[PDB]
Amino acid sequence: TLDDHTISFYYNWYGNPSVDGEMKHWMDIACNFYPELGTYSSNDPEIIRKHIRMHIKANVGVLSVTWWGESDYGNQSVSLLLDEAAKVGAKVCFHIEPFNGRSPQTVRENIQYIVDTYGDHPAFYRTHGKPLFFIYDSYLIKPAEWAKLFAAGGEISVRNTKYDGLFIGLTLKESELPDIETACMDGFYTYFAATGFTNASTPANWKSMQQWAKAHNKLFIPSVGPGYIDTRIRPWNGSTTRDRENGKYYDDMYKAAIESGASYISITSFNEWHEGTQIEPAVSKKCDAFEYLDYKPLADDYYLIRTAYWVDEFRKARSA
Fold this sequence. Notes:
Layout lengths: L2 E8 L23 E2 L9 H14 L1 E8 L8 H13 L2 E6 L7 H15 L13 E4 L7 H8 L15 E5 L6 H6 L4 E3 L16 H10 L3 E3 L1 E2 L23 H13 L4 E3 L14 E2 L18 H18 L1
Parallel strand pairs: 1-3, 1-10, 3-4, 4-5, 5-6, 6-7, 7-8, 9-10
Antiparallel strand pairs: 2-11
Helix pairs in contact: 1-2, 1-8, 6-7, 7-8
């Protein structure tokens, strides 16, 4: 019971002295919550076995792994990830991030690497026969220049080739949806876990957005989160803070996603700890210079268990 239309955003940039030879991303760490798995490595099969089992518990069938271009080719954590996922039926797609000199041409090279290296893997994600890529801060590149990658006529088109797929742009506001169409992107997402951080990430606008997507034959994939806090790494950013409200925040935002009519839902995040959007189990932790936020009075794995509640509601409503 892993839903193949529910996708988590997954980060694999964690490391530690034990596995990797030094702390990575974690640095008394760089987040407001402390993980059950501790300051873990993304290159630890026993972490990755667990992360996959946690996706089992959440009923989530697709992981979207942060991807930084060339520097990430032949990355250890991705192999381990795919292999673990393949054991249980979970799937991996890629979240193409604003890496150095990202261009429609270097986005193409990255697509080719991913299909050639992972394309054949049993856990590599296809939906209606096509791989699926999430493009963060895609708006950094002009729509007209994307069309050279994503239009049928484009000069470096991937359409009609073995690198064709479903390509999903980040939208900031509703009024900019036509940029999606110019770009010849197969759809759009919203990413941000914080309600009203952007106009596209305000849940009231979602019904209108899904309507637009269907009239334009596009996929809307709203992003749902359980809360948001990044004040340990951004003391100034208190304005983007959203309280978990004992689950209520997660429930209002996921229901909004399902009522929208979207056929795909994305979750920000499984494990963006820096931003406090993770559904990954967190424990209570005190320590000298800072008391962490936790899920209390809720269980450590509440957010995984409540995601299964919502996946089900999502699957039921899709089935009608």
